[PDB]
Amino acid sequence: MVLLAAAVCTKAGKAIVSRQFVEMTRTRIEGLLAAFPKLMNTGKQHTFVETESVRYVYQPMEKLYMVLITTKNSNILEDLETLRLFSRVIPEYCRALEENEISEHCFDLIFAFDEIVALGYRENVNLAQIRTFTEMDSHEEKVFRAVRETQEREAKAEMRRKAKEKEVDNFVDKLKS
């Protein structure tokens, strides 16, 4: 993990959608987080705030915020890419932007979190390709036609049966000293 939740946010004091990598507690961790986020703490601007060693990572994208959270150190850029990246992905994933579309393609969207990121690891590239992996496959089909068919033959037949029946060193020395 490098993120116990990704929650995609809309301005509302409320985060439009979320997923809980790990359950234990109740939303109050998440619920409390939601509250704080909605409040924004009046704070003016800035796309990042970490407070109390918790990264609250966000990106306004419009009236929307996409949010990630973490507490101990990270390499920034990567991160950014993601926020941004989210901001690339959605109109594809759930269709454009307005909660509803997403409301219909919730399943798709959550699926995307997992898919995209396996526990804080940037899994791939290529969205379409990303579609590919599941509920879009190939193997299963290959297998099915042949198999189904084979069985079918047995069945058909059955129908009848039925039917009828240097450098290093510089350092090293210095140090060594």
């Binding site: 084979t150 069985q151 047995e154 059955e158 049966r161 039925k162 039917a163 009828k164 029946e165």
Partner: protein
Amino acid sequence: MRILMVGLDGAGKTTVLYKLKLGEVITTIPTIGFNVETVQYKNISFTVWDVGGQDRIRSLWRHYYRNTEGVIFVVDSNDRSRIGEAREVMQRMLNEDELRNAAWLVFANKQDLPEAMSAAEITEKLGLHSIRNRPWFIQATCATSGEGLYEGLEWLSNS
């Protein structure tokens, strides 16, 4: 129709099934659970629960207590063991009323596989001789044999 294959499945009770279904054989671990197939005839597509009569699974089938429509009893005709005991159980099916909504088939399977009883011998023995408020013609299979089955069945859906 809900058609029931019970007894402990893994013995090739399941074989019996897999043989129908793909032509194949038990290439599963011996199978406690629901095995499902739909077989279409009179286009009543018979949904077969090949379910082990192993402990829980026998014990617990209440959601499957609903109303029957077809009976396969898949038989170890080398079993001639749990059948009296079975008879003793079997009564409670009899004591079920859902259970009286099927014109059926006991299938004697596993004939080659060791031997089998008098078609009659069994008939009393599971307590089978005694019915009528459901039809009760008898049909032997084996599990490496069985034909004319379908005569049995023929009458059966057309009851």
